[PDB]
């Protein structure tokens, strides 16, 4: 079950990957989650067929497939790694790591996110080993332990490549650089000085090749320094260039550790920005390289200068009440009331790990959200809907230049699935209701849907083989966000958890 | 509108085109959807409308549809009612089963359930006849057939004039009350160790046909079980070549050409002109037969797949086995065709009634059978090896033969590398659907056999495709999983592997873009 | 992995089996456990070599192998049934019953004891099914349930053939006759009228073809009728011809259910019989067909008329104090003191399931025993040694004509292993100390020993292939009797439990 | 009497005949017991004295014996002291291991431990050097070598002039302090991904020999690890044919006949007359070599098993590989001999020093190696098949070649059907002991190769036979279990199976009737 090859992936390649491939977690290193491919447009997306599906191992499916040179690399729950013909669905090889039993939590935990570099596939194992497999055969190139004990420190977002260095987080409590050839540790940074869900940068890590900076976030666990903090570090040495705390007094497990994206924007924040918390009145206006996105579950969209971390603006998305205000320098003041009384949002967020996408060409950011609040208390659960809100699942389209909401669309069932932007002005998203849906980037209108065997829980991607654009997504398991459907009073949501699979769609052509 | 109607004999005898309420859509077992929205011209446009995850284990199931609901048997006797257009679960019955590997292993899959009144009927894994309320999945009646172990069911129960009837897999066939389940009769086989296959009720002649002493076909009355006629289709069987497979009752101008491919024997007398007929291939051997549906008079017989278990066939019903194929002492390469999974097996054939074309899923496959003395002592102990291989001039396993039932002549035959081992579905738009061991779900032209469209399921495409209608839209549905005996046939492919994924169990439903 | 054959076993064959075969549990149907083979004698037994061994499944090994026509039939723990070339140790076939989990209790419970009849091997499964396999292929001929529920009623001694009928006990609470071709039940007898270890005839059942009577015992659970009772029934109908209670007021779980043997003897009981409890003074003297042996753990040796159950004599073996006296008709009076105070023997007996043997030619009975008592209370356990007794393991040789002890030999380590008599005047026995030993029937002297990988826990047998006499025994697991070694103050006993195997020995020749 | 003596270098260099205190009985690794009580005349009388159950897993172990005690490594690093004459357990150390399948899989078996002072030494599965007290099994020292995962040990540590030394399986060889375990040196290989095999210390020349850049033999000083000489025995290796196998140091009148079977090359210059020598077959390939023990000057080289990985061999140490055997594109049947388990592997050879006869366990075995294009796209993906088969004219796998080390000529060669894959033991009574994949434990005549006696173990007879003495009685001991890679070779046997039982793990000890 082997291939040889080529086309060995350099740092230059990761910095300018082929339009038709998906070789970083967000396809480009600055993230975005945007396929520049254009065959599938709004006019024809309603014709999309299933080309092929393949069954995956049971467990939570949160995976972003990678495609290189016509090969799909697919991490299954339980550290089963597969390489599949990305046009036909024929298995090439499969590598099963021997585990087993009880570490950090119908089978496994997500190994969602892998990296390609040189001729290796890299992932962090359920027991915290950095592991490199050969692309051609699935054979182990190296297996190195990052922990000591053993322990119960894990990792779910996975490693990324940053200028030859392999960088990875945790779920002790640090981010670490590693040698791409040996896997030996080059540096580690902890988050918190020396004197409640997941803890310690298990979110997505973003490398910008232009400024040569790696960006990661910490979680909670004075302001409680440096909890829930965004860090911009150099990749070879881990040195810290700039930081900023996005949520100080966190009593709600809001985990400011999700993907932030680096891009060029005309910085032109509007005072009519919805959910506006604060615009720095001393910041320049005009073209600028920027770090922007929603880092925390609480839903605040921020923009910083990428390089200096100069604060630009901050703004609400989902209704929330943990944050009383943010000043002119982006210092957050938490609502001490919550730390009468309806806490919004939840510990499953307005947002959570399911990633936002950015269309770089129009500068629209698309974030999958959930309208949900806590509660003092079909059958019963801890959550409830925010005031005057009908539906739970939501996607918000926001202009990263002005901060103005372009549109905002909802459906009853919880979302809790990533979105994928494409060059054809169409946006894909799954969801807790098993639906895989195509929306218009222009309007938010649904142009196409299918329905998967399970919750449409994983990251949609897009790639090309022989001129055909493909769109793929997995795949299933039990989703924390399907439990959000308890707040729905008018309908049960059929969140089937068994039947895991990856699915690949295409124009009939 | 949304009225959820009772199912009567009569609805069973005359189904609306949009429904699939008998195992084979009609009681006569054609497996033909008369719907036409999907044609040879547009089938290429088919989209996935919805899928839904099923329980793990092997999927050999034929869903039933009635008034917008899909009723679907999952392995482990989990029964589901699913909204047929959207995939919304309506209800799910999980029957408390004692323990797996206490029951018959061959009873893991459930192929068929029956609909009657407002109940769904299945025979459990622990050999009970169970009736669930269509509205809710709550138990209406649970009735023990007897278990003194490892006796279950495979192909499902049917309705025959207000009477529930099922086989078993190990001998039994029984008739039951449709409101109570009480046993009304019992016919004994002593294959005689199982009437496990599909049972076919003709509401015209009031005759029930099942397959078995040593492979005989039986025509019994549904009220009493009284044997009206019978016929032995493979006598000295030395290869588990059961003849319990679905036979079809149809009217057809019987004018059998003497040019039948694989012609074994027609007849002197005979008749011609027709004739309500039982026909099809009942054995694993792949021999196609024809009888008078009410007398069981022999009409004609032909070969489909290559075989050599049958020497000749006299003009009256026969059979005389080829002795060259029987392993009797010793140490020599025996070539036996086909295999224990045949060229043909449970995966059902379809017949298009309008065209008179019979569509049979096959496998080009043989084995070398050698028994070799281990040279132990004290004892003459032997090892016996069955290596599977392709027949004389075949590149490909897995095939569909379309055959005219009037002439007995072959319309077309198409192959592909991977084992098929999957049922076929005929629709009124001139398209034929078939699964396969390679995960692919394909639409074929009924005219030419050409592949017009395919998609690939997450698992082996192992269950029966059906078609139905909701609000004027035609859907095509199929499941969906597990490990298949058919997958093993691919070992005969030299070098190339076929990705027969077992995990990922699901039912899928396709339709034209609306 | 198959054979065909022949030599189909009739009732006539079971009644007069070949000297060189072992086709009933005790080789002949009347039990005895005696190989009429003569090659191995006292003069040459010291030369015995290992010919072959084969590994068995883990779990308790209590098995009596069967040999027919050069084939060994061997029941492994967990209902794994093997047929092995009995001269070479080559596996022919193996049948694994699919079980699993928790029923009546390093893997399985003993399926010790199987029967051969016609061309089938019969056993009762761990979940109480009567199961018939073809001798040639290991294929299931029939599998029928004897219970209803399911339950927790099991069986460990196994079925026997009695004139075409298959008879079997339990561990609800009855003995049952079954059809040899279909396995359907023909009759069942319960033990106890309608108004604490194992309960309900899980001991060995004895069929006499001469009187056509089946003999079985009940366990405990007024005299408490009919507890701990010996029953003589007809095989086709189960009808009860005679009975006798061997231990009425049982508060010690003494289980009068072990093998009793049917033989012709010159009835000539001596008043100088050791441990003498009672001789019926009204019973005839002279040649007579008799039922004799030790049915209960408490060690009393009885003799009855086989046919009428007329009581002949009763006599102690191991020291005991549960029984105050037995009258002239064999009615037992229990010592109400125990029901100050050292209760002898134990619940693991003087005797337990490990079987006695009888040499029919000299009329000596050989019983493996254990000198052990309870206690009011190396490390610690519930047991202790009886007054003035040094060693735990013991074998007693008793004349069944006079009741007089011929000899009695002991060793420190607990015995708890069956004995096998042979025609060459040598007696085999294993033990809790891993030793497999050959004793002189004349003297009790040890003439030969080897040492097995594990406790020598199973029944030794003997058979012939091509003129060579073979002696075989298994095999291991955790033995209840190895726990008896706690009462040893001067030495630990190395009772290795892992390494299960059957072993076959022979003269070098 | 019962004095339990300390082991010094010197006792190690000059073992009493009755003891087995170095992996191969003597430091020079002959695996020869000089005891004579057991002879070719009476070995047929051998009785089982005692056995004892071992932990499950694969048994490749060589027990050590000293002053009446057997020290025995069980899989899972359970270490036992057993009374050597009776089988009474004395003590058992169970090391708390983190979790299986976190450690190197190839480290499951432990072949060797070392004795020194009053401690037993082993390298753990988790790559620690551990010293246990001979008296008790209590831990004296536990020292971590480094683990950054899946690095363990296989063949055991040795003593070399007060220095503990071991390889690994993935590169490392290291020297340690005998009282503390502290690392005293480290030699790096970058097979170079493992010096996993047996390591041979010569106390005469003070030289340690292990097998590896690309398969070279190394002679290092025990104090410092300083490489004194080296030699590459298989350069362009394309078949995992490691050369880490035991080589032997012996004095031998070097007069190599030019009639050596499988003669590759002798020499012009050379010397003759002898010479303390390193010799034996170091590769899986089965090529027998000879060097000066102190210079590593090349002397001669021959073939044992059939092979074609080696083309030719120049008169100076060579090697030049046959290119016909390297799989380079495509679609053709490659015949490569031997296999990845060779004709030779870890199972050790024995040398009788008095007779100068070298006794090597082999396997007549080859494979057909074909790579076939799957015709995927996009990608050129291949399947690669290794079917195992017998060599040109062989009926039998599994063999012992006895070869004279002075002449290089073959004394005898005997075979049997089943794979061997088991070490050999030479004794001073002129008998050779060998296990096997067929469970049989056999004594051979060193004179003729004839089988003089056998018994059958409960499992594959997979570990090394040794011999020792207690109170004047000679014992022969061997274990004892698990699943063997060698068992797979039997697939090349057509029809006949060999009963390679994996469960039943044990050590057995035999002796003459007393
Ligand atoms: Ca069958
Ligand atoms: Ca290696």
Protein described:
- Four copies of one chain form a homotetramer.
- Chain A is mainly β.
- Chain A has a single domain (1-509), classed as Quinoprotein alcohol dehydrogenase-like superfamily (Methanol Dehydrogenase, Chain A, 8 Propeller).
- Chain A has one helix and 38 strands.
- In chain A, the strands form ten sheets. A five-stranded mixed beta sheet of chain A has the order 3-32-33-34-35, with no helix packed on it. In chain A, strands 21-23-24-25-22 form a five-stranded antiparallel beta sheet, with no helix packed on it.
- The two termini of chain A are 31 Å apart.
- Chains in contact: A-B, A-D, B-C, B-D, C-D.
- Chain A binds chain B through residues 46-58, 88-91, 434, 450-454, 476, 494, 496-503, 508, and chain B through 44-56, 86-89, 439, 455-459, 481, 499, 501-506, 508, 510, 513.
- One calcium ion binds next to loops of chain B.
- It is classed as oxidoreductase.
- Keywords: 2-keto-L-gulonic acid, Ketogulonicigenium vulgare, Beta-Propeller, Carbohydrate/Sugar Binding, periplasmic, Oxidoreductase.
- The assembly is tetrameric.
Summarize it.
The structure is a homotetramer. Chain A is an all-beta fold and 509 residues long.
């Amino acid at each position: 079950y082997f291939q040889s090859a080529q086309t060995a992936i350099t740092d230059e390649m990761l910095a300018n990957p082929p339009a038709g491939e998906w070789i970083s977690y967000g396809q480009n290193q600055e993230n975005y989650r945007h396929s520049p491919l254009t065959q599938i447009t709004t006019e024809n997306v309603g014709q999309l067929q299933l080309v092929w599906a393949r069954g995956m191992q049971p467990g939570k499916v949160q995976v972003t497939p990678l495609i290189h040179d016509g090969v799909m690399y697919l991490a299954n729950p339980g550290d089963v790694i597969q390489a599949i013909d990305a046009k036909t669905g024929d298995l090439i090889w499969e590598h099963r790591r021997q585990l087993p039993n009880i570490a950090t939590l119908s089978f496994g935990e997500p190994t969602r996110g892998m990296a390609l570099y040189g001729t290796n596939v890299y992932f962090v194992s359920w027991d915290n080993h950095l592991v490199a497999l050969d692309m051609g055969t699935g054979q182990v190139v190296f297996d190195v332990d990052r922990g000591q004990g053993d322990e119960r420190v894990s990792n779910s977002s996975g490693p990324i490549v940053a200028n030859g260095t392999i960088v990875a987080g945790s779920t002790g409590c640090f981010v670490s650089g590693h040698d791409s050839a040996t896997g030996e540790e080059l540096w580690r940074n902890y988050f918190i000085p020396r004197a409640r869900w997941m803890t310690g940068a298990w979110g997505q890590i973003t490398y910008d090749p232009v400024t040569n900076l790696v960006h990661y976030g910490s979680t909670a666990v004075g302001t409680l320094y440096g909890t829930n903090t965004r860090f911009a570090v150099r990749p070879d040495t881990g040195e810290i260039v700039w930081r900023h705390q996005t949520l100080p007094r966190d009593n709600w497990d809001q985990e400011c550790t999700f993907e932030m994206m680096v891009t060029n924007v005309d910085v032109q924040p509007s005072t009519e920005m919805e959910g506006l918390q604060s615009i720095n009145p001393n910041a320049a206006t005009g073209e600028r390289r920027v770090l922007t996105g929603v880092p925390c579950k609480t839903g605040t969209m921020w923009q910083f200068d990428a390089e200096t971390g100069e604060f630009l603006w901050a703004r609400d998305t989902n209704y929330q009440n943990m944050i009383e205000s943010i000043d002119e320098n982006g210092i957050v003041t938490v609502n001490e009331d919550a730390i009468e009384y309806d806490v919004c949002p939840t510990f499953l967020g307005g947002r959570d790990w399911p990633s936002a996408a950015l269309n770089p060409d129009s500068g629209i950011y698309f974030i999958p959200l959930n309208n949900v609040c806590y509660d003092m208390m079909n059958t019963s659960n801890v959550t409830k809907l925010p005031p005057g809100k009908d539906m739970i699942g939501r996607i918000d389209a926001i202009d990263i230049s002005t901060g103005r909401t372009l549109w905002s669309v909802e459906r009853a069932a919880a979302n809790y699935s990533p979105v994928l932007s494409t060059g054809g002005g169409v946006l894909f998203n799954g969801g807790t209701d098993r639906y895989f849906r195509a929306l218009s980037q222009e309007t938010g209108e649904t142009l196409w849907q299918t329905r998967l065997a399970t919750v449409a829980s994983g990251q949609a991607i897009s790639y090309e083989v022989d001129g055909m654009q493909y769109v793929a997504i997995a795949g299933g398991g039990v989703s924390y966000g399907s439990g959000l459907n308890s707040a729905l009073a008018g309908e049960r949501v059929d969140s089937t958890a068994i039947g895991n699979a990856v699915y690949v769609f295409a124009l009939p052509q």
